[PDB]
Amino acid sequence: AQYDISFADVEKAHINIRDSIHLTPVLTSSILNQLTGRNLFFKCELFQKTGSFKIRGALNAVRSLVRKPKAVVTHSSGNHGQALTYAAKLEGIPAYIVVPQTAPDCKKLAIQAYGASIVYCEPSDESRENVAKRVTEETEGIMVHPNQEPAVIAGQGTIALEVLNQVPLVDALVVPVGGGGMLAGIAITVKALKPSVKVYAAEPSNADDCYQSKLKGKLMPNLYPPETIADGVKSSIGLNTWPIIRDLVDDIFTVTEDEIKCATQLVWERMKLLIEPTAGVGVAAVLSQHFQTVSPEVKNICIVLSGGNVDLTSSITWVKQA
Amino acid sequence: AQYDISFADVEKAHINIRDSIHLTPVLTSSILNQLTGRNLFFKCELFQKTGSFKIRGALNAVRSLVRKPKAVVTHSSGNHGQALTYAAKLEGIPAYIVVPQTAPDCKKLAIQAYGASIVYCEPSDESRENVAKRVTEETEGIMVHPNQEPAVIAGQGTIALEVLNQVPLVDALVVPVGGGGMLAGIAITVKALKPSVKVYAAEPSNADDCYQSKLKGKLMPNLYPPETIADGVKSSIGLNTWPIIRDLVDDIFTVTEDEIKCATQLVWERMKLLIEPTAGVGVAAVLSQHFQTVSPEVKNICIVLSGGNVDLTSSITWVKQA
Ligand SMILES: *Cc1c(COP(=O)(O)O)cnc(C)c1O
Ligand SMILES: *Cc1c(COP(=O)(O)O)cnc(C)c1O
Ligand SMILES: [Mn+2]
Ligand SMILES: [Mn+2]
């Protein structure tokens, strides 16, 4: 009944960011329709400013602060970091981004290109959170969490406002899940406007905390730091997004590393959209064996292609020839 | 005054193919605007059916035949071959595609995937033309030339009808040139509707026959088979497209291999559009030193991103890390 955001927060966020973001297109694919037997629609957040949907939450959070702040601080595998740095730069606010050592080089470099101070941490939720806390204290900055901050969650939710308008007959949204900010914002939004529309999460089997949490009915974070090509969804879900996910998300589909790699390459080759592997997670979910159990009434499915920030040099390892 | 096609042919082609092709989007890039000091618009033919704009000419040609034909035949580095095979398959007509031995593997495989009989030839204009002639005779098929066939040229020209509608304030179109079918169709169209709009060709320095022809005022085909990463524009311009290009194209910009590689990678990384290197030729042209000499009045420039059929495995060689 009462969560850390409401639909009204999402509506407000949309008005406050729409002049500063792209109304990204919804594209289709005949081959992917044929492979799934569904009518698919691809929400192209890879074309968003900074290369992912994270600009939505970042702009909303920075503008929700509006003496100006001394600094903004966060932890990020890269996309929220880039987005926050860009949003903060527009207001003349310096940014400190705490980033795991094992984040992709392209993401590390982009954060530095936008002028942030990058601070490497160890690759775990605990290290990300603890180092961001220390950096926040040292800089006397403002922490803008990548997925648990209400202003961030409300910003990500605005994706659903656009999808429901662009695909008026949509039956389901499929959303990749890491910390659950996007999934939670979208769930709040869809279930407020047209709750008959399904909200499905897609998650790596190698980082399956959201799936485990829903199964067990309690928050079950990753016990070991995840090893996955879906580098942007290694975070566990958190205390603010869990209750929304528990109550408002219809199902969660897990996908293996091989499935993620295959779906990502299929989008590259067939749609010509350079999605990052994390964005391939949603595509893998709809292609998966378990998704065939979804009712045939759920025909019009919109998959969020959440980002396009991929290391081309690092992607030469897993790319397979036909 | 009188060329092998007219504007009326392009208009007719558009009505005859529009129900069967995508009205591809026009996208923008802030970074590419910043780099060029121009206002750029990208016509996304990479999203077209079969991965390039060639579906336009192919559908128009196949439907311009409408006992049904025994077979269709062509020569192609891959894109026209794929498009022709698809168009012919819709009508239950078999296809024989003559393809140079050194065409990219992805293109060879796609032609076979669409059900064509592929016939390898030696990598030269002479071999392509001679083998297609022999195959046409042996199969008693109909030759559909990739760039000199009027129905094909008229089909490619329809790109300009869309661009002029989608970018109403456009000042110039930039078009990659191989055989000159697209360039000629676009030139006929633009100069009929709003001749103040510039039509610029973009060409590899390593395959610079169009540039040489315009300089010398006569058709000067490539003396040696071109060596270029822009694998789809190795053909010389021909007898039907040359007069149109001579008279109606405003300038031709050549770009080196390094420029093509750099522009292609920039589009991948910054726009998240998986263009093939041939489609990077137009982007390289607007980024080139010589394009800076174009009048500052030519502000709104639409570049045709002509195709997305790229060998990912073969592209691991030239991709450079930042
Ligand atoms: C952040 C991100 C996600 C996951 O969003 P959460 O709010 O962390 O669940 C998915 N894809 C991409 C590209 C992202 O950057
Ligand atoms: C065919 C083609 C061109 C060139 O068109 P021509 O009519 O041969 O000049 C450019 N880019 C791509 C991707 C093509 O397939
Ligand atoms: Mn997870
Ligand atoms: Mn040439």
From Swiss-Prot, chains A, B:
The EC number of this protein is 5.1.1.18, 4.3.1.18, 4.3.1.17
Location of the active site? 54 (proton acceptor), 77 (proton acceptor)
Q: Which residues bind Mg(2+) 3?
A: 203, 207, 209
Tissue expression from the record: Expressed in the cerebellum, hippocampus, dorsolateral prefrontal cortex, and in motor neurons and glial cells of the lumbar spinal cord (at protein level). Increased in the dorsolateral prefrontal cortex of schizophrenic patients (at protein level). Brain: expressed at high levels in hippocampus and corpus callosum, intermediate levels in substantia nigra and caudate, and low levels in amygdala, thalamus, and subthalamic nuclei. Expressed in heart, skeletal muscle, kidney, and liver.
Q: Where does Mg(2+) 1 bind?
A: 11
Q: Would the keyword Metal-binding be found if you checked this record's keyword annotation?
A: yes
* Post-translational events: S-nitrosylated, leading to decrease the enzyme activity.
Which residues bind Ca(2+) 4 per the record? Answer: 240
S-nitrosocysteine: modified positions: 106
Pfam family name, one: PALP
Question: Which residues are involved in binding pyridoxal 5'-phosphate?
Answer: 79, 147, 178-182, 306
Q: Name one GO cellular component term.
A: neuronal cell body
What is catalyzed by this enzyme? L-serine = D-serine; D-serine = pyruvate + NH4(+); L-serine = pyruvate + NH4(+)
Q: How is its activity regulated?
A: Allosterically activated by magnesium, and possibly also other divalent metal cations. Allosterically activated by ATP, ADP or GTP. Competitively inhibited by malonate. Inhibited by meso-tartrate and malonate.
Annotated keywords: Allosteric enzyme, ATP-binding, Isomerase, Lyase, Magnesium, Metal-binding, Nucleotide-binding, Pyridoxal phosphate, S-nitrosylation
Q: Which GO terms describe its molecular function?
A: ATP binding; calcium ion binding; D-serine ammonia-lyase activity; glycine binding; identical protein binding; L-serine ammonia-lyase activity; magnesium ion binding; PDZ domain binding
Residues the record lists as binding Mn(2+): 203, 207, 209
The entry's Mg(2+) 4-binding residues are 240
Where do the annotations place ATP binding? 29-31, 49-50, 82, 114, 272, 309
Give the UniProt record's GO annotations in the biological process aspect.
D-serine biosynthetic process; D-serine metabolic process; L-serine metabolic process; pyruvate biosynthetic process; response to lipopolysaccharide; response to xenobiotic stimulus; serine family amino acid metabolic process
Protein function: Catalyzes the synthesis of D-serine from L-serine. D-serine is a key coagonist with glutamate at NMDA receptors. Has dehydratase activity towards both L-serine and D-serine.
Complex and partners:
Homodimer.
Q: Can you tell me which family this protein belongs to?
A: Belongs to the serine/threonine dehydratase family.
Q: Specify the protein name.
A: Serine racemase
According to its UniProt entry, this protein's organism is Homo sapiens (Human)
The lineage is: Eukaryota, Metazoa, Chordata, Craniata, Vertebrata
Q: Which gene encodes it?
A: SRR
